[model samples]
Target: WTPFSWVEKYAYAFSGPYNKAEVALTFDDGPDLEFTPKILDKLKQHNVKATFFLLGENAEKFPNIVKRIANEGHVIGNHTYSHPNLAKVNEDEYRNQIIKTEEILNRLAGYAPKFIRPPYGEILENQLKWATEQNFMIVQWSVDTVDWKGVSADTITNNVLGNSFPGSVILQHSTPGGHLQGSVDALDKIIPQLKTKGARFVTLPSMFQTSKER
Candidate 1:
């Protein structure tokens, strides 16, 4: 059982480049009532667009927040119906989880998601197969904040900024139990600082090409 072996099959081997100074900021397990809104306000203030990988159950509970995400023009992708390690589940269960979440998102937001990021970034071969069958482009980050480990705000900022390159995907989260606050705090410093250094933000889909050949 290789970790994230799905990349060998359904996933693009790399996230291609954008502009000379472009980077992608992505949030996971969001649509949170409090933190997500705060994130939105901050992004709006900076005039930056980020991608969100929302948990279906959370979106169902916070339908308005989900709507707000779309209304504000952020790219929203499915994290899962519930955050589950797809590598540990059977193929049927994995497909159902994605489909169920897609249905919920389409119902509330008026369209199904075109992207997915597996929980824990763990994807088995079957998971990839099913995801491909459903026409989702799987997104994986190039830089991890690791803020979930309770790292300090400055440390989180350093981790992300230190590793980011052109077209890099920087991963953070908006879940209640994680070190999300550190990431949020870090953003204030990170975004503008990076911008001054000529970094521009973009959503994931815009960073890659899509095709029916899969």
Candidate 2:
């Protein structure tokens, strides 16, 4: 659990609205040179658009991947310049990290993302105020696929399909602390099965917009 988890309720952490039958797939810590492309290919094959919350350092190191993510019609989100735990940093430091990442994303993606997904889903009250002042939305997830654990592809697929529902925001990681091939492999299975259930995978913006229209 995040430090000051109680304050998280005050933060605008969105998991979409339950009234719609939409699911947004969000990949975090990405723009990885190896795994990201595989994930992207899977999405392209399925004609599904997703949101990638990229680390600034990774985005800088792999600018071409970042460009490709934007070019291929996926939404880009700021995951900070370095993946710092929000509770460990002071308010100014947190703000600076976000701004630094925003600049890089704006330069590479051609637009600054208004969405922020804190590393480890950690946030404090002041950080929430900062996001609100900056007009950034805090994104949270309804379902965690737990692919980062390097679990089997079948396990990841079952975790997602078993727990996800309409308007679910599913979290997966594209960058590796653990093996990512399982994540890539699971995508091939998950997408088709989710489709069979009439679930439309969409980008975060589209999901939020659809919620607004409803």
Candidate 3:
């Protein structure tokens, strides 16, 4: 849950629309140097596109994956330089971290991010102010894959497929963590399950649903 989780949201959170058979899968904290390519290859094999919230330094290390993601029609978002919590730093430090990533993203990927998922889904008012000033939408997820916690691939798949809805934004990690294979292989199975439900997987931008539409 986010620090702002207590109240209702206005512009920061998106849960999607139940009316459409569409859902978005979002990954963060990669390219993990090892498993990200596996995720990419699977996505390519399935003819799927996903949104990745990328780290700046990691993006620099894996510029090829960054290029491939863009060339392959995936959505990329800012995920900070080192994946540090925004609340731990002062506003200047926060600006430095985010602006550096912004510059790197433009330099490497050629397009700016329209959205940013703050590290750990935690943020303060200053972060929101910066986001608004920069015109970036803060993207948060409704469904947690829980893959980062080293859950089984089956459990991870079930967590996503079971909890997900037409408008659900699924939280997953494209990078490595404990039992990283669980995170890696879960997508392979879950995507088909999502497809079986006649749900069309979508990029984050395409996942938006207006209140009237929902």
Candidate 4:
């Protein structure tokens, strides 16, 4: 199987820079009502920090969670308002969507997200170019747990542990889905397991920084 990988596949943004052994754990489609807090608690327990891609409406609906995500020192990014396919929306409309999200996040954190993850791994040139010109970076994952597929928690853990390497960016979700608990379940095992192998967990933005300093 041609497994999911973010290494050099996407443009304008990715993690690791491949010269180091650090990894980034990034979640998408969330600020979900149920599972997000659980994920956060686990993160706190393990002293692990991760990045969250927030759907604009989810941020509006769950401002407190958004605040907590920022307050507790995690990176946040726009995942579009309703999670639209940016390639399908009109160019102006797509731009508007980005701005509208920044507006909401700005009010919450006094600034907008400097990063974004195009929903569904659908990366487009215009979105990347515009965002970069505006000082935002795109984040695509290198290794995915495929937790949305209702895989077992053990399977999710393997997807990450087996694939993660220096500069690996692991993609997971914080949304409530069929196997959502798998992500939370996998985290407890994943973090320590990776740490045992000398992987340093860092936020997406921080990961990118290390990538470029090379």
**lDDT: worst 10-residue window of model 2:** 2-11
Off by over 4 Å in 3: 1-10, 176-178, 209-214
Give the best candidate by lDDT: 2
The per-model lDDT (C-alpha) reads: 0.80, 0.84, 0.78, 0.78
Where is the poorest 10-residue window by lDDT in model 4?
A: 1-10
Candidate 4: stretches off by over 4 Å:
1-11, 176-178, 210-214
Give me the runs in candidate 1 sitting further than 4 Å from their true place. 1-8, 210-214
TM-score of 4: 0.90
Best by TM-score: 2
Clashes of each: 0, 0, 0, 2
| Native-to-model Cα distance after best TM-score fit, residue 160 in candidate 2, in Å | 0.6
Per-prediction TM-score, please? 0.90, 0.92, 0.89, 0.90
Per-residue lDDT of model 2, residues 1-214, tens digit only: 4434533554364577677778999999988878899889999999999999999999988999999999999999989989999978999899999999999999998888988889988877788777867677777788998887789999999999998888899998988444878888999999999989988888887876622100
The candidate, 1 or 4, that scores higher on TM-score is: 1
lDDT of 4 by residue, 80-110 (tens): 8888877678778788888898888878866
lDDT of 3 by residue, 1-214 (tens): 3545522433577567789898888889887677778788888888888888899989888888888777878888888899888878889888888788878887777877777788988778767766766667777889988787889889998788878888889888876444577777887899998899898998877775321001
* List of clashing residue pairs for candidate 1: none
Candidate 3, 93: how far from true, in Å? 1.3
Provide the lDDT at 39 for model 2: 89
Candidate 3, after superposition: displacement of residue 21 in Å? 1.2
